[PDB]
Ligand binder design. Structure first.
Ligand SMILES: Cn1ccccc1=O
Ligand SMILES: Cn1ccccc1=O
Length: 147
């Protein structure tokens, strides 16, 4: 029926159907369109107190809760989708990863290099698409597939 990971869902507020991807946590009104050795992604990471290393270039000691981190991720997604903010600008300013200095770019990678939820979401994204919140031991990620 639909591409890998996608399923139909029902909007509680509006009653209109939408599409949700359980690998990438992406959700959208439009029916999704239509695997490579390598993909290229950028990401925006929000760390929290249970992160594998609760530190970043932004904060020596990261104290926010997982729930607080998810709220921040949700808000960044809203601003990217409305177009008030660009993914790359938010990543440079707010990502808790060293890759913030490269507008979130991680370069290209193969399967078996990244943490598995990040890998699976990256390879289920189509070129140019963006994930919802993706959870790993580092924190909570927004992922943008660029190649
Ligand atoms: C095809 N399509 C169109 C608009 C937003 C998302 C998407 O996947
Ligand atoms: C997202 N990411 C970045 C570096 C190493 C592993 C990983 O999952």
């Amino acid at each position: 029926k639909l591409p890998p990971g996608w399923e139909k869902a029902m909007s509680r507020s509006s009653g209109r159907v939408y599409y949700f991807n359980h690998i990438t946590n992406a959700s959208q009104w439009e029916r999704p369109s239509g695997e490579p050795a390598r993909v290229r992604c950028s990401h925006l990471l929000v760390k929290h107190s249970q992160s594998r290393r609760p530190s970043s270039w932004r904060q020596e000691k990261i104290t926010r809760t997982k729930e607080e981190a998810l709220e921040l991720i949700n808000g960044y997604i809203q601003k990217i989708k409305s177009g008030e903010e660009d993914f790359e600008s938010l990543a440079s300013q707010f990502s808790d990863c060293s890759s913030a200095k490269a507008r979130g770019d991680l370069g290209a990678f193969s399967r078996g290099q990244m943490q598995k939820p990040f890998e699976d979401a990256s390879f289920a994204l189509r070129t140019g698409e963006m994930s919802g919140p993706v959870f790993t031991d580092s924190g909570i990620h927004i992922i943008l597939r660029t190649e």
